[PDB]
Amino acid sequence: GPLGSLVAIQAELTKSQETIGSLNEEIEQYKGTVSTLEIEREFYFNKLRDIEILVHTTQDLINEGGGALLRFVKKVESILYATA
Amino acid sequence: GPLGSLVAIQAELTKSQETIGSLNEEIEQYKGTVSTLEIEREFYFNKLRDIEILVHTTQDLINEGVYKGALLRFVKKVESILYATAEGFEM
């Protein structure tokens, strides 16, 4: 009857509001994991950038103003731009 | 009466089943963003590892005199950059 249908929907509704609660919990932990990975990424990208700047600057400095130095600089450059 | 309240709670229920649907899409999006960041990481870690090997190997040839200056200066600059990257693996 009316009461039975009201009770069944109310039960499924509170069960649904539970899932929403647990899915929001997951989203907050995923937001936290993306944030950590993005903080790490900015740090490592800066170190690789410092190596890239050094490689290109030395390549320019060798040009007008390298023997074994140029050979090493080119070996580093090939490591940076390799695709795997 | 009872029909009105049944209609209002059924509407709340189907609306909440739609939010679970959209929250599951967000989770799949977030799983995809964590996966991309972890794939980048493995690739850039591999390059750092290869630069470390190269830096130490050529330092061994400069130390154990196998060249008969500016090269050692450059090798040491790279090594300091690599050490600073190792130092920030906790921070």
Swiss-Prot record, chain B:
It is found in: Cytoplasm, Cytoskeleton. Coiled coil: none annotated. Residues 12-91 form the EB1 C-terminal domain. Belongs to the MAPRE family. Present with 3630 molecules/cell in log phase SD medium. Binds microtubules. This is Protein BIM1. It comes from Saccharomyces cerevisiae (strain ATCC 204508 / S288c) (Baker's yeast). The gene is BIM1. The chain holds residues 182 to 281 of 344 of the full protein.
